[PDB]
């Protein structure tokens, strides 16, 4: 969270928090309800954001659906949409934290080593997350949608 981040930076410089740092934690705890509602909307439309984005994936990157293809059918294509639910969950976490750090630790540090091991193309996972983004920016209005989207675009961009 940005509380952790402001404590860690002040501790490093062996001080108490600055004015600009106490204002940043205030702006954050008073945005906390906006956050908890964006997250709630995304957790509720879980099944939808994943299935509709996976359906959309197989129509922009069709190469990964069977001839050769890492998602090779009934146990595999299921696992590809699993991984999409793993990043949807890390994105709600990030939004209530005001911080990309729980997405980084759990799913972005070492993401290239792991997917080159399994033989999965990572441009295709980035494209998947870009498709869940759209399906979420539909279910979300004006400023809630600009905010959830900051966190989907970071995840996508750490994947290529």
């Amino acid at each position: 969270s940005i509380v952790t981040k402001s404590i860690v930076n002040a501790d490093a410089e062996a001080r108490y928090l600055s004015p600009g740092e106490l204002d940043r934690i205030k702006s954050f705890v008073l945005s906390g309800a906006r956050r908890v509602r964006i997250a709630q909307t995304l957790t509720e439309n879980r099944e939808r954001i994943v299935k509709q984005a996976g359906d959309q994936l197989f129509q922009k990157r069709p190469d990964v659906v069977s001839p050769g293809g890492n998602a090779y059918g009934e146990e595999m294509t299921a696992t590809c949409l699993r991984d999409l639910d793993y990043y949807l969950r890390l994105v709600t976490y990030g939004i209530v934290s005001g911080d990309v750090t729980p997405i980084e630790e759990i799913g972005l540090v070492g993401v290239r080593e792991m997917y080159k091991s399994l033989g999965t193309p990572i441009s295709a996972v980035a494209e998947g997350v870009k498709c869940m983004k759209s399906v979420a920016s539909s279910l979300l209005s004006g400023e809630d949608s600009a905010e959830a989207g900051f966190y989907f675009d970071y995840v996508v961009g750490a994947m290529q």
């Binding site: 509380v3 952790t4 928090l17 908890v36 957790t43």
Partner: protein
């Protein structure tokens, strides 16, 4: 090194669970006490040099510890002792701003009793000095911010005893 918000997020993640109503409850409970924490936090930064002067006066001064052969005799040791007091107060404010005592288990109490028994530092006179620092702070941040703050001063004492 976690505050109340990541504490909930990790507990969710070892279960592969999205944030449920129970987790949202604990979360809204921090965000509610949040403005309380930033204000008490400022009041300590503002009164830091001062809480320490008063706490030292009340417990440590004009005693055996400040006279020759005492662990606070010499300027080097007097200055290294109020440095420690600064560390205790700054870190208890951190853990309150965080909502969680893990910065204190991590970067403060991690084998301190061992260091203190090695250099020959009196732990009892330090717990004495922290309990006074506990009284002066609570009588400056007010009651709501003080029940909370005290927890972290108390967490330090129990890790030294």
């Amino acid at each position: 090194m976690q505050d109340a918000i990541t504490s909930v997020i990790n507990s969710s993640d070892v279960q592969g669970k999205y944030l449920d109503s129970s987790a949202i409850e604990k979360l809204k409970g921090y965000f509610q006490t949040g403005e309380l924490r930033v204000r008490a936090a400022t009041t300590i930064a503002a009164n830091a040099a001062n809480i320490i002067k008063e706490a030292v006066a009340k417990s440590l001064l004009y005693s055996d510890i400040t006279r020759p052969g005492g662990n606070m005799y010499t300027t080097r040791r007097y200055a290294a002792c109020i440095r420690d007091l600064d560390y205790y107060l700054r870190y208890a404010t951190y853990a309150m701003l965080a909502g969680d005592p893990s910065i204190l288990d991590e970067r403060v109490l991690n084998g301190l009793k061992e260091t203190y028994n090695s250099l020959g530092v009196p732990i009892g006179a330090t717990i004495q000095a922290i309990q006074a620092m506990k009284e002066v702070t609570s009588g400056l941040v007010g009651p709501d911010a003080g029940k909370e703050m005290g927890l972290y001063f108390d967490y330090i004492c129990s890790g030294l005893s």
